[PDB]
Coordinates of C-alpha atoms in Angstrom, one line a residue:
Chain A
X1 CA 116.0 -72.0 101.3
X2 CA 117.5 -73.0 98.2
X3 CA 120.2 -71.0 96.2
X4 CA 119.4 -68.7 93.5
X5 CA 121.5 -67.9 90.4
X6 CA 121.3 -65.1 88.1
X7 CA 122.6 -64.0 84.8
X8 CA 125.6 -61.6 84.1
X9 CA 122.8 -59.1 83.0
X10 CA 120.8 -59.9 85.9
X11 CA 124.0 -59.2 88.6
X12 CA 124.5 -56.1 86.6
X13 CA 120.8 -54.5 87.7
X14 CA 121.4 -55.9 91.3
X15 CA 124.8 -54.1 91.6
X16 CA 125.4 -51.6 89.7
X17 CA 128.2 -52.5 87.8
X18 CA 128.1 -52.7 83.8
X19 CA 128.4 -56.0 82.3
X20 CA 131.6 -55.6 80.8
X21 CA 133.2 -54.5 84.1
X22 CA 131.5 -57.8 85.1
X23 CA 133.4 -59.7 82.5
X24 CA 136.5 -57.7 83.2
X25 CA 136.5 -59.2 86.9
X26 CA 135.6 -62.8 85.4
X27 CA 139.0 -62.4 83.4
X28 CA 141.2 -61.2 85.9
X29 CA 139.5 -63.8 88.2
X30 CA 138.4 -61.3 90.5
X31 CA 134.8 -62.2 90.7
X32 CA 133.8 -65.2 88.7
X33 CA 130.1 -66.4 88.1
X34 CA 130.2 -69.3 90.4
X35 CA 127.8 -71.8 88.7
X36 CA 127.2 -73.3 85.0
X37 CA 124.4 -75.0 84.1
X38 CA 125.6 -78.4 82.2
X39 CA 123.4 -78.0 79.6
X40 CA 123.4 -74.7 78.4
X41 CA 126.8 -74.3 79.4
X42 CA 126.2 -70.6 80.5
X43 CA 127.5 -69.6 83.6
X44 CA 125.6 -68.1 86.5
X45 CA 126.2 -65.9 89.6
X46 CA 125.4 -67.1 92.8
X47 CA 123.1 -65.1 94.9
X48 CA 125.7 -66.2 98.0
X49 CA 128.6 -65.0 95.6
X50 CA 127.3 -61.2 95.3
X51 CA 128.3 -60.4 98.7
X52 CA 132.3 -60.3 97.1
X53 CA 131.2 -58.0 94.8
X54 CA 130.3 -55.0 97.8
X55 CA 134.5 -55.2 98.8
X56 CA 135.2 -54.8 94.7
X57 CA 133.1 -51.9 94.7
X58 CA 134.4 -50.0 97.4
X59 CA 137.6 -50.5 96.5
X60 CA 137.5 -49.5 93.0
X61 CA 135.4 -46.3 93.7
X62 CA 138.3 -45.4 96.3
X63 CA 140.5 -46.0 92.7
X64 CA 142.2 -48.9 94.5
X65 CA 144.3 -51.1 91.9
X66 CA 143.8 -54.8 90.8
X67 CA 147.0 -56.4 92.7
X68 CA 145.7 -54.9 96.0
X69 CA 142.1 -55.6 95.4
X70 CA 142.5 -59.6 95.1
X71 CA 145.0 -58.9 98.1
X72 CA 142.5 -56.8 100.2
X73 CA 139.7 -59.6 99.5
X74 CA 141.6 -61.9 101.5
X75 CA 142.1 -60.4 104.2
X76 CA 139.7 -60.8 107.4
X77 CA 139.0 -57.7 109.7
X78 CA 142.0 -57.1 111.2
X79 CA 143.9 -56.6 108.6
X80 CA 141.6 -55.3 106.1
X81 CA 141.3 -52.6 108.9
X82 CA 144.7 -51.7 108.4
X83 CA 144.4 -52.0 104.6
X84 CA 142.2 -48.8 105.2
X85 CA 144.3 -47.1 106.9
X86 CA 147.1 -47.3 104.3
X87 CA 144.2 -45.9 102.1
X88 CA 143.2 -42.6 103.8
X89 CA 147.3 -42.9 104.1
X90 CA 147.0 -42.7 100.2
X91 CA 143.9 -39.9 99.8
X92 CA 145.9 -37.8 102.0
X93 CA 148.7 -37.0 100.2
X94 CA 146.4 -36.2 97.5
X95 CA 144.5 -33.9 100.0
X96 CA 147.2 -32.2 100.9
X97 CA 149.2 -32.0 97.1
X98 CA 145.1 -30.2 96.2
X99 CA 145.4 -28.4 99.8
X100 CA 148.7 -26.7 98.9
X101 CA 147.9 -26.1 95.0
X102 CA 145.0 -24.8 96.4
X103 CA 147.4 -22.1 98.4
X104 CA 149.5 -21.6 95.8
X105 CA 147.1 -20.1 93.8
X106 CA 145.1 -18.0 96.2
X107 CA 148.7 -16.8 96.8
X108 CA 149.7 -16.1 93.4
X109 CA 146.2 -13.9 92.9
X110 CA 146.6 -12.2 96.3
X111 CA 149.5 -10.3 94.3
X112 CA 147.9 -10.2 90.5
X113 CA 144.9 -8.2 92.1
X114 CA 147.0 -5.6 94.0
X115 CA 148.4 -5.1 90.9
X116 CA 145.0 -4.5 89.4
X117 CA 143.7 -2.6 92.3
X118 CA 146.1 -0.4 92.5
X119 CA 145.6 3.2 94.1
X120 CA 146.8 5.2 91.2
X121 CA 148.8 3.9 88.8
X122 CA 152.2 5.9 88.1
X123 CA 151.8 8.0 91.6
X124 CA 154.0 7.6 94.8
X125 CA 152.6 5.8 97.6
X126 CA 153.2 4.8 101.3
X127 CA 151.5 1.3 102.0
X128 CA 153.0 -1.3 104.5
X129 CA 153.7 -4.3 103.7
X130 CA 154.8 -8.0 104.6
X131 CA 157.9 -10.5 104.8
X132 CA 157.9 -11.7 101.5
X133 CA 160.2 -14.6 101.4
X134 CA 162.8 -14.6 98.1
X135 CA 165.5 -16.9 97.0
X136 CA 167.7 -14.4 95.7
X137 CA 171.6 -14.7 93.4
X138 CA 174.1 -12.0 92.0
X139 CA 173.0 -10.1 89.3
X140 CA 176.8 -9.4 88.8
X141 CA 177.4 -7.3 86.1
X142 CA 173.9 -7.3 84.7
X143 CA 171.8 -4.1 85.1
X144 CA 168.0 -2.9 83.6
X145 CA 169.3 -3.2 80.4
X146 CA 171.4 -6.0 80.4
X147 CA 169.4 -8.8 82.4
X148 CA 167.9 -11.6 80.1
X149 CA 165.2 -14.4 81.0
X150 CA 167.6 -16.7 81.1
X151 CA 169.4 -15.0 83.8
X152 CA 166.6 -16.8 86.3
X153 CA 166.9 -20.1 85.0
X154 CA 168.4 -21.7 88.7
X155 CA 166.1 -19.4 90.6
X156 CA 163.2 -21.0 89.2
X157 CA 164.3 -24.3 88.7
X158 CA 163.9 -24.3 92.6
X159 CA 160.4 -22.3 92.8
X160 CA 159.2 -25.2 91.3
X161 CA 160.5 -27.9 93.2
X162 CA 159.0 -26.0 96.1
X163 CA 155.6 -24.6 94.5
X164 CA 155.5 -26.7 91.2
X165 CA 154.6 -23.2 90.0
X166 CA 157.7 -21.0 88.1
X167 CA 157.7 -17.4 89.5
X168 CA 154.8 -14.6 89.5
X169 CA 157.2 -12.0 89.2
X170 CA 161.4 -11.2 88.1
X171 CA 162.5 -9.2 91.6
X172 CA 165.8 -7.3 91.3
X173 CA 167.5 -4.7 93.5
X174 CA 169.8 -2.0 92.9
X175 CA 171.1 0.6 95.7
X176 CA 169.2 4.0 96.4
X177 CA 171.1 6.5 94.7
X178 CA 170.4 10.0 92.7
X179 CA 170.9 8.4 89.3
X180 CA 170.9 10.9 86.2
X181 CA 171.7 8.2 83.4
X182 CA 170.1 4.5 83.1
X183 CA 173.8 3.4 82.9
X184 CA 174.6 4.8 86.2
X185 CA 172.8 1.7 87.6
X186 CA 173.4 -2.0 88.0
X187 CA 171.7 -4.4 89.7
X188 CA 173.1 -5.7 93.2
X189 CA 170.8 -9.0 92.7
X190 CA 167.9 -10.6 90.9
X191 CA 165.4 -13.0 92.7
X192 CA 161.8 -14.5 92.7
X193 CA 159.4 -14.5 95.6
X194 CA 158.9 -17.5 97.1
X195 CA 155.2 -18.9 97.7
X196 CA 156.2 -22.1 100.4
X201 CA 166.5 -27.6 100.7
X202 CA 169.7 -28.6 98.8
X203 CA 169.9 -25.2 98.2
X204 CA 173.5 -24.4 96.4
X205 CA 176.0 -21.8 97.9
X206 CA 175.5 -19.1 95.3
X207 CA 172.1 -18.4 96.1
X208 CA 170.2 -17.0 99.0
X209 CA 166.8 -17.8 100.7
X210 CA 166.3 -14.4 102.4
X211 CA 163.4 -11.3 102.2
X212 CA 162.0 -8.4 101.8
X213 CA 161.2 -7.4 105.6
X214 CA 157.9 -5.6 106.6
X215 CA 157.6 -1.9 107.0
X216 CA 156.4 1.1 105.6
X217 CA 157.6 1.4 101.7
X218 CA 157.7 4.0 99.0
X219 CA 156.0 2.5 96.3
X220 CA 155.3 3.6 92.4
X221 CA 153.6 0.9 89.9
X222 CA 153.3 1.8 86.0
X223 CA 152.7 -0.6 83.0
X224 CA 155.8 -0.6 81.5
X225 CA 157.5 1.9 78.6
X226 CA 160.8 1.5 77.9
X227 CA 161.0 5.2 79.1
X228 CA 158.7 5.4 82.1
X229 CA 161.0 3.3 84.2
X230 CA 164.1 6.1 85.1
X231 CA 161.7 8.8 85.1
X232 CA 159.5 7.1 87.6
X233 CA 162.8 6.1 89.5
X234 CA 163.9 9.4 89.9
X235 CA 159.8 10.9 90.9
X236 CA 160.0 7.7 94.0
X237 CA 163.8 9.6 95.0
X238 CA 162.3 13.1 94.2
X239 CA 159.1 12.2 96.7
X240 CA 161.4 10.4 99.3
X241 CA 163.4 13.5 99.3
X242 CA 160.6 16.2 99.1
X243 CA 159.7 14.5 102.7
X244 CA 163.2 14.2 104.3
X245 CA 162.3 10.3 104.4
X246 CA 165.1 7.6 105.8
X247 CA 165.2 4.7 103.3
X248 CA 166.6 1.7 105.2
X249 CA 166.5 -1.0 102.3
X250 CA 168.2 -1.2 99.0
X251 CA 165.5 -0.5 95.7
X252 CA 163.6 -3.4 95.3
X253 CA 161.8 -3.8 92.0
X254 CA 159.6 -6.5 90.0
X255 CA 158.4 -6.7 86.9
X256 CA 155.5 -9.0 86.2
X257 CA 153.9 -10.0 82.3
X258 CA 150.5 -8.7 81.8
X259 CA 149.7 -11.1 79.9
X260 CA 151.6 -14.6 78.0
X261 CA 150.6 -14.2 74.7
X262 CA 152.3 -14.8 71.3
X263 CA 150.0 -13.1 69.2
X264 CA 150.4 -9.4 70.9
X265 CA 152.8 -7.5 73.0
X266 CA 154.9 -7.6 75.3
X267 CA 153.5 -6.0 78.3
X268 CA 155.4 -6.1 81.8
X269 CA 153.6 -4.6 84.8
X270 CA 156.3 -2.6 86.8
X271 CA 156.6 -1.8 90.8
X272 CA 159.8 -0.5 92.5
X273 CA 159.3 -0.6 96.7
X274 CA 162.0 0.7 99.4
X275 CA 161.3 0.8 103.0
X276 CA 161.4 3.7 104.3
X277 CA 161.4 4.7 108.4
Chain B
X1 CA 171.8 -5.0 74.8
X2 CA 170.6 -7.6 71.4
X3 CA 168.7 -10.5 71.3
X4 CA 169.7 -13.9 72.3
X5 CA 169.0 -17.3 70.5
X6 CA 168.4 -20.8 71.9
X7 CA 167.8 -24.5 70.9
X8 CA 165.2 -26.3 71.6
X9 CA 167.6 -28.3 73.5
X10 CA 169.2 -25.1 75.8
X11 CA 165.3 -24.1 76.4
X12 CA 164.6 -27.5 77.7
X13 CA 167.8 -26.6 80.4
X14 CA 166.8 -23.0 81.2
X15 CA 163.2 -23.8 81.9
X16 CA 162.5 -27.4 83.2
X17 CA 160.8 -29.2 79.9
X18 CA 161.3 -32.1 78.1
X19 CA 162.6 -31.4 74.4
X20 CA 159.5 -33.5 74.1
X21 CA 156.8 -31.2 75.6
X22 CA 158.7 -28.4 73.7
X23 CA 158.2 -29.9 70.1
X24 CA 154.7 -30.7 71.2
X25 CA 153.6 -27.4 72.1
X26 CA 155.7 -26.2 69.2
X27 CA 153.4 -28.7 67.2
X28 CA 150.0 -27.5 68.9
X29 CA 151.3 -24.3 68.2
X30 CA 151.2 -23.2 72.0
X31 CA 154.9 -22.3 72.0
X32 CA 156.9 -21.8 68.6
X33 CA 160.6 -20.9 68.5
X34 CA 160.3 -17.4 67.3
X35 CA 163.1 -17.5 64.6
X36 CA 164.5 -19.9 61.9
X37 CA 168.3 -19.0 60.8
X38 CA 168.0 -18.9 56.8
X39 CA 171.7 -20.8 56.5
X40 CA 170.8 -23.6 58.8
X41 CA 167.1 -23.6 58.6
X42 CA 166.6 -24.7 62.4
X43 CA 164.7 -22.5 64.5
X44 CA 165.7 -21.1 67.6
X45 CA 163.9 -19.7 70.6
X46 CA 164.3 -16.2 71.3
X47 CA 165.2 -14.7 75.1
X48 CA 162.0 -12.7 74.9
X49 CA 159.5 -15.0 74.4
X50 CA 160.7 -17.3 77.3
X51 CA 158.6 -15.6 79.8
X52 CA 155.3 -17.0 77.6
X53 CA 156.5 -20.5 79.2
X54 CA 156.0 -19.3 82.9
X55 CA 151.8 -19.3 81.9
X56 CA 152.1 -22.6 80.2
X57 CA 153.6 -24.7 83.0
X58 CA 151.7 -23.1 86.0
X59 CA 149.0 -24.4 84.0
X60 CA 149.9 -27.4 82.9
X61 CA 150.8 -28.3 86.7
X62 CA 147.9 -27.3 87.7
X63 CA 146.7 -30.2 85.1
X64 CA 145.3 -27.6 83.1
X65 CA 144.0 -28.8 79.4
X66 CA 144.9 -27.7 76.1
X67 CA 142.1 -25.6 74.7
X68 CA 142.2 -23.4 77.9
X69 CA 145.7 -23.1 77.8
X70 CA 145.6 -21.4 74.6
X71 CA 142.6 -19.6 76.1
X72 CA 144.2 -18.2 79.2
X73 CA 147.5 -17.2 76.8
X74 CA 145.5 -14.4 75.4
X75 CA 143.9 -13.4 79.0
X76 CA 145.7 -10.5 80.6
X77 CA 145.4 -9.5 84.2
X78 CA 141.8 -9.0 84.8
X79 CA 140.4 -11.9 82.8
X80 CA 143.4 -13.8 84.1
X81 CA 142.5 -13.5 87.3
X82 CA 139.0 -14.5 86.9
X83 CA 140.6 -17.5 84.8
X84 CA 141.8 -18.8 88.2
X85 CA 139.0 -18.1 90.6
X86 CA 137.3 -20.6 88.2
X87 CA 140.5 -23.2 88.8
X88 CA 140.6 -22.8 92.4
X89 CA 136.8 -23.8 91.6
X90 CA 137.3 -26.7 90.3
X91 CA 140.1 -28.0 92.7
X92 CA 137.7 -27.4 94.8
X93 CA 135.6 -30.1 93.9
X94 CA 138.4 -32.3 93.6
X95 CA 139.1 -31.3 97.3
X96 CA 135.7 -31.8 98.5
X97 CA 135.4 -35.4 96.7
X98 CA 138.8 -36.7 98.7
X99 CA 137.8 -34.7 101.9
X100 CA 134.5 -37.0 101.2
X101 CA 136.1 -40.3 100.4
X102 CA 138.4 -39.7 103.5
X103 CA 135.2 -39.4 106.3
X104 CA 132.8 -42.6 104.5
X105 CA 136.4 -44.3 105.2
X106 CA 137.4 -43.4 108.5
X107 CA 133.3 -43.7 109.3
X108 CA 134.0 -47.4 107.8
X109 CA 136.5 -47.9 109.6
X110 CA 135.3 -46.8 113.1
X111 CA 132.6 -49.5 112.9
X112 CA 135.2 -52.6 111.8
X113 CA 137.1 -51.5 114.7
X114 CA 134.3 -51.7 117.2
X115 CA 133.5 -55.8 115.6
X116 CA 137.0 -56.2 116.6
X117 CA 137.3 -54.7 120.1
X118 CA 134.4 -56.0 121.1
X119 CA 134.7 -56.3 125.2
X120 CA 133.4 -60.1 124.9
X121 CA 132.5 -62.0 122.0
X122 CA 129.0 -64.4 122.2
X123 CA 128.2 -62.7 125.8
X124 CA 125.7 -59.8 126.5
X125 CA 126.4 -56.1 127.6
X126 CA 124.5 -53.0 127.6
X127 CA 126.5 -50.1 125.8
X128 CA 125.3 -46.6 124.9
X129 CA 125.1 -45.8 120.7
X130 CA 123.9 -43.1 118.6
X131 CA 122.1 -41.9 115.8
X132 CA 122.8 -44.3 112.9
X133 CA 120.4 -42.9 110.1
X134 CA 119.4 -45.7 107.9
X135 CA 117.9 -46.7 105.1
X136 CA 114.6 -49.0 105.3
X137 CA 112.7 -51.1 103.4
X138 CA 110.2 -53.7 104.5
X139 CA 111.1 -57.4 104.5
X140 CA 107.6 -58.8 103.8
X141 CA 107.7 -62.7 104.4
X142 CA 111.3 -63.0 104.2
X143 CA 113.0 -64.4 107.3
X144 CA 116.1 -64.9 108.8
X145 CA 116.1 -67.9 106.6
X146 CA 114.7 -66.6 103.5
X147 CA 117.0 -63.2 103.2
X148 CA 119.0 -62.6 100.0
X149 CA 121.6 -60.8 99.1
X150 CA 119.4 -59.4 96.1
X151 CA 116.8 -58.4 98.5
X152 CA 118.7 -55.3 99.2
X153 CA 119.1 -54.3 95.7
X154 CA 117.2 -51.4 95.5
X155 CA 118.3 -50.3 99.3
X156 CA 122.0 -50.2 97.7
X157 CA 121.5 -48.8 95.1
X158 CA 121.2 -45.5 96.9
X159 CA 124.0 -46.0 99.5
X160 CA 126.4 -45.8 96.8
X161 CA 124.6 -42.2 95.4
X162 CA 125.3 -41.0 98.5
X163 CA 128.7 -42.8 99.6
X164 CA 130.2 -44.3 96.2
X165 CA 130.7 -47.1 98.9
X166 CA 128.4 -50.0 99.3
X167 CA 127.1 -51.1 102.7
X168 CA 129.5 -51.8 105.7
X169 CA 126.6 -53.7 106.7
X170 CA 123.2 -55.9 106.2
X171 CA 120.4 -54.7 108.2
X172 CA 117.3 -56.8 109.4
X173 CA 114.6 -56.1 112.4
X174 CA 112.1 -58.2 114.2
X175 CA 109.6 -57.6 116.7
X176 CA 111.4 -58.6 120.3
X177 CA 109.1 -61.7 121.5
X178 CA 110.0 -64.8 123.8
X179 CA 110.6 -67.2 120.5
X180 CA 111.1 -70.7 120.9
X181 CA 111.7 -71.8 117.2
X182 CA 113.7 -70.4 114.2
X183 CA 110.3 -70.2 112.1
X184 CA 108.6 -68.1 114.6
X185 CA 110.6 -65.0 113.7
X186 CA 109.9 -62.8 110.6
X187 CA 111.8 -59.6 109.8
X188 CA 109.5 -56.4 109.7
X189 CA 112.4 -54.3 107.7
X190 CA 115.2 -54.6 105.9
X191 CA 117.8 -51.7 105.8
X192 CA 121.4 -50.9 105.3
X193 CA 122.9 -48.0 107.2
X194 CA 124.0 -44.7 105.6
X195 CA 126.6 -42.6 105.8
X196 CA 125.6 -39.4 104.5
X201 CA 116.7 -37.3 97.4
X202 CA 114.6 -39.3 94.8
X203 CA 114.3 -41.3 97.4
X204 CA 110.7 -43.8 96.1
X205 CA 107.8 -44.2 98.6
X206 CA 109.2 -47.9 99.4
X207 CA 111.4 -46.7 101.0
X208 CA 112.5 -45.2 104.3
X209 CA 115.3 -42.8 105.7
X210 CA 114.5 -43.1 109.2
X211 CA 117.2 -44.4 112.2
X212 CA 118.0 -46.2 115.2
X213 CA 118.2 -44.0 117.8
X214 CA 120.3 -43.4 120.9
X215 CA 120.6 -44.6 124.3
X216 CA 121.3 -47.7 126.5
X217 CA 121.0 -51.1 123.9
X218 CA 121.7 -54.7 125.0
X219 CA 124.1 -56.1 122.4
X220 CA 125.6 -59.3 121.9
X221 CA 127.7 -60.0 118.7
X222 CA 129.8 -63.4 117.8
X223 CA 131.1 -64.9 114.6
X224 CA 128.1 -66.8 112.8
X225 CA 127.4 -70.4 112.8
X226 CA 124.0 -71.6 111.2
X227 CA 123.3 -72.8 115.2
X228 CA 124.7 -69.9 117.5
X229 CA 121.9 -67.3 116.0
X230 CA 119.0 -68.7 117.6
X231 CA 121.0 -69.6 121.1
X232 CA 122.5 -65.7 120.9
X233 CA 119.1 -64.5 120.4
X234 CA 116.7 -66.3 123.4
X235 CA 120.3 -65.5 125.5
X236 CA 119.5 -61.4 125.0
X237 CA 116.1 -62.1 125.9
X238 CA 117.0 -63.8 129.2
X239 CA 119.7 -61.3 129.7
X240 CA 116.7 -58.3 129.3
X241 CA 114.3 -60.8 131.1
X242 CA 116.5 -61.3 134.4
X243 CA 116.9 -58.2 134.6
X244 CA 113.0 -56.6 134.5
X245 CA 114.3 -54.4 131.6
X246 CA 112.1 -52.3 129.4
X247 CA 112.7 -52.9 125.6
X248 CA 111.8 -49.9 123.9
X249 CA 113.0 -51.2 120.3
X250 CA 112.5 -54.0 117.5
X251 CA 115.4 -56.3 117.9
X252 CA 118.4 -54.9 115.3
X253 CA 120.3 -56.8 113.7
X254 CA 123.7 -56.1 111.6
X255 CA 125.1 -59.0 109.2
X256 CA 129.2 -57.9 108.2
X257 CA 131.2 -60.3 106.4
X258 CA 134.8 -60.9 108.1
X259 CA 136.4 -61.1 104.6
X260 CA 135.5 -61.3 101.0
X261 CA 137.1 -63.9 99.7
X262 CA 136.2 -65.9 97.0
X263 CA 139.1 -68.7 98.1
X264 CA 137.9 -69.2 102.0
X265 CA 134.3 -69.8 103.1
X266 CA 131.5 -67.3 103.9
X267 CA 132.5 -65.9 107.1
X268 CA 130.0 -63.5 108.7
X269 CA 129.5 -60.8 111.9
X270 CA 126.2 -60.9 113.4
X271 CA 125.3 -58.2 116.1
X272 CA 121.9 -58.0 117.5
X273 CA 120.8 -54.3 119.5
X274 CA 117.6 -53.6 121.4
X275 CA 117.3 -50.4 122.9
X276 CA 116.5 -51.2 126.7
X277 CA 115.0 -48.5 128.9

């Protein structure tokens, strides 16, 4: 009938936008009260203006940037339809980075409560289990008394760049043998479980297949570990058992603390047939 | 075998930090190389205490804060576990939000495509719809001339509690009668649709329902409205149809640009028997 003009404090009740985000737009000329009254020299919105504002509002609750929103305003249907479609193009990626984090973390607690619930806790048991992917390397030289953090520097500088994550747990294997003396063993490799390219020659994407497996878990002591080596041969042998794999172990912190202990959680598997 | 030293800047190489987050967690005291030679006074990191930086860079990609960084340090494997239940929460959330966003955008979307394949534009055709829940209001007195864009304050207000978004669309009814001027025609309601409580007594979540409607849509003009409109009536009157309906109509600006000049959508349903 006639147009009507509000007040930056009036368009900020009508939208709901604050009236500093309203000044905001009126400085980066994104929306800009349309009207000033001569005298007063105020400036006013128009109420044919607010419609703009619904397109700013949409666009900045989907966190769209400036440089596309002034972009975006001008375009008609068409392409503002496609403009859309490069947005749930954008939200995506971000649904599927939470998606996988998401994974990665049901996936690393899939293993921390095993762990806890285990059967009984220095005892030899039989439980099956499943391909567990690992990217493995040569632990040449280096044995359970010999391999330092630092030895899985390149192994986990590739976890990450797969899971983001570093590694739940230090694998390492050694052969199945009758060892007497801790120094009778070495490690054949050390590796870290994968959870999900340009991977270098001296390392190995490969697994621990599925089967049955002799397993023994103990917090560690740094003299539990041969004697519950040899009590996983001794009960493989007191059943005439064919182990088909080499000995596959992992130790994992119980905790990442400064202020106590160190405390490794330890569990040495070989499948058996 | 002995213990191994590091600087801060063969720590930064090993694990995959800046010698910039290293100084800063040293700072925060969140990480701390463990030992200072008395000759040289620098401080090196120790082998052993490597393995405390696997907890702090899970978390911190998993854009973990500070104060629960330093919480979850001291956590071992039970509460630990718990710690991330209560992350996997609160991705979650992040994960419902974008999986949100994504359908109120492919739902906006789906409509603008419609506008533009529309089988003919400024012509009349009878196409089956559905359930578009709404939001209502009554337009007392104001007209199809008298409508502002402040009149649906209130009814926006609440779309965007629901959606974040505004509305796709401006909303309007009218009784279907034989009109013959612009002034004969009054709106009864007001409404904007929604696309997903506290909802005042003024208001009115109701919808326009499914089944056969007699659409026309065009590209406004302040003269093709009242043409468009007898031209449905004729189209329902040579055809001895039953109108079961107000008459619907659905304002949608084609851009919102502050450069151009208004340019506008106008569709007009009326559910026939």
């Amino acid at each position: 009938m006639k147009e009507s003009y509000y007040s930056i404090g009036e368009v900020s009740k009508l939208a709901n936008v604050s009236i500093k985000a309203l000044r905001y737009y009126d400085k980066i000329d994104l929306f800009k009260p349309a009207y000033v009254d001569p005298d007063t020299s105020y400036r006013y919105y128009t109420d044919s203006q607010l419609i703009h504002l619904d397109l700013i509002k949409s666009l900045k609750y989907i966190g769209t940037p400036l440089e596309e929103m002034k972009k975006a305003q001008d375009l008609e249907m068409e392409e503002l339809f496609a403009f859309y479609t490069e947005q749930e193009r954008q939200i995506r990626e971000k649904l599927d980075f939470l998606s996988a984090l998401e994974q990665t973390i049901s996936l690393v607690k899939k293993r921390m409560k095993r762990q806890m619930e285990y059967p009984a806790l220095g005892e030899v048991f039989v439980l099956d289990e499943e391909e567990i992917r690992i990217i493995q390397t040569e632990a040449e030289g280096i044995g359970p008394e010999n391999v330092l953090n630092a030895s899985y520097s390149k192994l986990k500088k590739f976890i990450e760049s797969a899971d983001g994550f570093t590694n739940n747990s230090y694998g390492a294997t050694f052969s199945f043998q009758p060892y007497t003396s801790i120094d009778e063993m070495t490690y054949r490799h050390i590796f870290t479980p994968v959870l999900t390219s340009s991977i270098t020659p001296d390392m190995e994407i490969t697994t621990i297949p599925k089967g049955r497996y002799a397993c023994i878990a103990y917090n560690f002591s740094p003299e539990h570990y041969f004697l519950n080596l040899q009590k996983l041969i001794k009960y493989i042998a007191d059943r005439q058992l064919t182990v088909v794999s080499d000995v596959y172990q992992l130790i994992i912190p119980i905790h990442y603390s400064p202020k106590k202990q160190e405390e490794y959680r330890v569990e040495m598997k070989i499948e058996i047939a």
